[PDB]
Design a protein around this nucleic acid. Structure first.
Ligand code: AKG
Ligand code: MN
Length: 201
DNA sequence: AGGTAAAACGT
DNA sequence: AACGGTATTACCT
């Protein structure tokens, strides 16, 4: 369990809820489809993304931001599914964050080779609130460091149903995903999904 | 006067 | 391929 101060991995926590979560990913994506976002610097991200809930993480020319509106559809992001919110609440409570109320869920899709380079989650104004991160499908190596980029990384395999929660002291810690290895999973076929819940408003 | 982009090539 | 440069710079608010 003990990843860092205020950080924990709940292994296979979402395993039982996974089938329903995956159906709801498909429902969300049918309204706001997965898209590979382009950085301010002009590079297309390997991870395909969408959002649900009140606020969605996005890139544009000027930087990163949380928007109530999907810039692709010009409609609000789909409502956060009850299955998402219920799972998130249970995970956060188990992790020691019983008062967490997310208003934002970023949905990441990793094809073979897709990565997410070391970054901080910092576009949220209320830093008191934790991050809840659900793994679905193919396994990936999760990097978890410290407050500085060059702080040593813990490398952890995240498997289908694993939930990682950080906050408090570890809230602004650098973290990332190494290039996804190809493979098969009975529920996702050829990809990894990640659900990242935050308080963005 | 701060916050931010790099959530993205060489050794 | 793990590690670290780049952003002690050029930009908007
Ligand atoms: O895919 C993951 O496990 C991490 C996702 C992430 O870091 C993010 O969406 O900010
Ligand atoms: Mn992140």
């Amino acid at each position: 369990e003990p990843l860092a101060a205020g950080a924990v991995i709940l292994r296979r926590f979402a395993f039982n809820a996974a089938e329903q979560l995956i159906r709801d990913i498909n429902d969300v994506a049918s309204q706001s489809p997965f898209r590979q976002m382009v950085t301010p610097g002009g590079y297309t991200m390997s991870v395909a993304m969408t959002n649900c809930g009140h606020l969605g993480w996005t890139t544009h020319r000027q930087g990163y931001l949380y928007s109530p509106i999907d810039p692709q559809t010009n409609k609000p992001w789909p409502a956060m599914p009850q299955s998402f919110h219920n799972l998130c609440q249970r995970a956060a409570t188990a992790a020691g964050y019983p008062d967490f109320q997310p208003d934002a869920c970023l949905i990441n899709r990793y094809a073979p080779g897709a990565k997410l380079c070391l970054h901080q989650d910092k576009d949220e104004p209320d830093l008191r609130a934790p991050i809840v991160s659900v793994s679905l499908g193919l396994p990936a190596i999760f990097q978890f460091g410290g407050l500085k980029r060059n702080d040593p990384l813990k490398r952890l395999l995240l498997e289908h149903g694993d939930v990682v929660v950080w906050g408090g002291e570890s809230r602004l810690f650098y973290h990332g995903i190494q290039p996804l290895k190809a493979g098969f999973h009975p529920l996702t076929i050829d990809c990894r999904y990640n659900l990242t819940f935050r308080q963005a408003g």
